[PDB]
Amino acid sequence: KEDNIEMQGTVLETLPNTMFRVELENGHVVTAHISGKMRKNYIRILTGDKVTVELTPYDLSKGRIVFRSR
Amino acid sequence: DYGKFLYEKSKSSKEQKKKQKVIQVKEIKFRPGTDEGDYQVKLRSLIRFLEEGDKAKITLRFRGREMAHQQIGMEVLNRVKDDLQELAVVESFPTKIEGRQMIMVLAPKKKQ
RNA sequence: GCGGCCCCCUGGACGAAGACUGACGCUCAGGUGCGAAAGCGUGGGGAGCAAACAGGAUUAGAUACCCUGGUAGUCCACGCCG
RNA sequence: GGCCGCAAGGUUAAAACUCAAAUGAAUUGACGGGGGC
Ligand SMILES: NC(=O)OC[C@@H](O)C[C@H](NC(=O)[C@H]1NCCC[C@H]1O)C(=O)N[C@@H](Cc1c[nH]cn1)C(=O)N[C@H](C(=O)O)[C@H](O)c1c[nH]c(Cl)n1
Ligand SMILES: [K+]
Ligand SMILES: [Mg+2]
Ligand SMILES: [Mg+2]
Numbered sequence: 622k623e624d625n626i627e628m629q630g631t632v633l634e635t636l637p638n639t640m641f642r643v644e645l646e647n648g649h650v651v652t653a654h655i656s657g658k659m660r661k662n663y664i665r666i667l668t669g670d671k672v673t674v675e676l677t678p679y680d681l682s683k684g685r686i687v688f689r690s691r
Numbered sequence: 692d693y694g695k696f697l698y699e700k701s702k703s704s705k706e707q708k709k710k711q712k713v714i715q716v717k718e719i720k721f722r723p724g725t726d727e728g729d730y731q732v733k734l735r736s737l738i739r740f741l742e743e744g745d746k747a748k749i750t751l752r753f754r755g756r757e758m759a760h761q762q763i764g765m766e767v768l769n770r771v772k773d774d775l776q777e778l779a780v781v782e783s784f785p786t787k788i789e790g791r792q793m794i795m796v797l798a799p800k801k802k803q
Numbered sequence: 804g805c806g807g808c809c810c811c812c813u814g815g816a817c818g819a820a821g822a823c824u825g826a827c828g829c830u831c832a833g834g835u836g837c838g839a840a841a842g843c844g845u846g847g848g849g850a851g852c853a854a855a856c857a858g859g860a861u862u863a864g865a866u867a868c869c870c871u872g873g874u875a876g877u878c879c880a881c882g883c884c885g
Numbered sequence: 886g887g888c889c890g891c892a893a894g895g896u897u898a899a900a901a902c903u904c905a906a907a908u909g910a911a912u913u914g915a916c917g918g919g920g921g922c
C-alpha cells in the first residue's frame with residue numbers, strides 16, 4: 622500500500638472464480654480479481670473494457686481491478 | 692380403382708422429397724462466450740447436416756452490453772466461413788443486428 | 804428359488820403313543836460345496852420377443868423417450884464365470 | 886503384490902493429498918408438470 626502503483630488496462634478474457642486476464646498500458650499481461658464494492662454492488666465485467674488496475678511492487682504479474690469504464 | 696395407382700404418386704413424392712431433403716430446416720446457435728473448442732463440437736454436427744444437403748442457419752446472441760462483443764462475434768461467424776469455405780456456399784450474411792441476434796445462412800456446395 | 808396333467812427315482816419337515824442309546828452337545832479361523840440375471844467355450848434349435856444396427860418422426864440439437872424392422876441373447880446338452 | 890479365470894474380471898487391500906465437516910431421525914414453513922373438499 623505504501624507507495625502504491627496505479628495503472629489502467631484492458632480485460633482480454635474471462636477466467637473461472639471471477640478472476641481475469643488484463644493487458645497493461647505498458648504491454649504486460651496481469652491476472653486480476655475484483656474488489657469488494659463492485660462485488661457488493663453487483664457490477665459485472667465483460668471482455669474488452671478499459672479498467673483501472675492497482676499493482677504492488679512485490680509482484681507485478683497479478684493486480685486488482687478498482688474501476689471499470691462502464 | 693386399383694392399388695398399383697398409389698406407387699406412381701409415391702415416386703413423384705420422393706422426387707419432391709429429394710428436392711425437399713435440402714429444404715429440411717436445421718438450426719445452430721452460438722454465443723460470444725462459447726470458447727475452449729466447444730465450437731468445434733457443434734461444427735461436427737453442422738458437417739453432418741451439409742453432407743445430407745440441408746441449409747444451416749447460424750445464430751449468435753448478444754445481451755445488452757455484450758454489444759462491445761459484436762466486434763468479435765462477427766469473427767466467430769467468420770470462423771464458420773473459413774471452415775466451410777470448401778463445404779458450404781455462402782448464401783446470406785447479416786449486415787445488421789436485429790432484436791439482439793445475428794442470423795447467418797449457409798447452403799452446402801453442390802459438388803460437381 | 805419352486806406353478807398344466809400322468810408315471811418313475813429321491814431329500815426334508817411335523818403330530819400321537821410307546822420302546823431303545825446314554826451327553827453321543829453348541830459354535831467355527833483356514834477348507835469344501837450350492838449360488839438370480841447378464842456374460843464366455845463347443846454343438847444343436849429359433850414361434851414370440853429384443854441390446855447392437857437400419858429406416859420414419861421430435862427438437863435448436865435428440866447419438867433418447869415414440870413408430871416400422873432386426874442380429875446376439877433368450878431355449879437345449881456338457882464345461883466356465885462366482 | 887499374491888491367489889483364481891479361456892476372457893470379461895473376482896478376491897485380499899494401502900498411502901500421499903485435501904475439508905471442517907459428511908451423516909441419521911424428526912420439527913416449522915415454502916414448493917410439486919402430487920391428492921381431496
Ligand atoms: N427437444 C425435444 O426433445 O422435443 C421437445 C419435447 O418437449 C417434445 C415432448 N416429448 C415428450 O414429452 C416425450 N414423452 C415420452 C414419449 C415421447 C415424447 O412425447 C412433447 O411435447 N410431446 C407431446 C407431443 C409432441 C409435440 N411435439 C413433439 N411431441 C406429447 O404428446 N407428450 C405426451 C404427454 O404430454 O404426456 C406424452 O409424452 C406422449 C404420449 N404419447 C406420445 Cl407419442 N407422447
Ligand atoms: K439304561
Ligand atoms: Mg419323500
Ligand atoms: Mg459324562
Ligand SMILES: [Mg+2]
Pocket residue numbers: none
Ligand atoms: Mg470360512
Ligand SMILES: [Mg+2]
Pocket residue numbers: none
Ligand atoms: Mg443365463
Ligand SMILES: [Mg+2]
Pocket residue numbers: none
Ligand atoms: Mg424398437
Ligand SMILES: [Mg+2]
Pocket residue numbers: none
Ligand atoms: Mg429426513
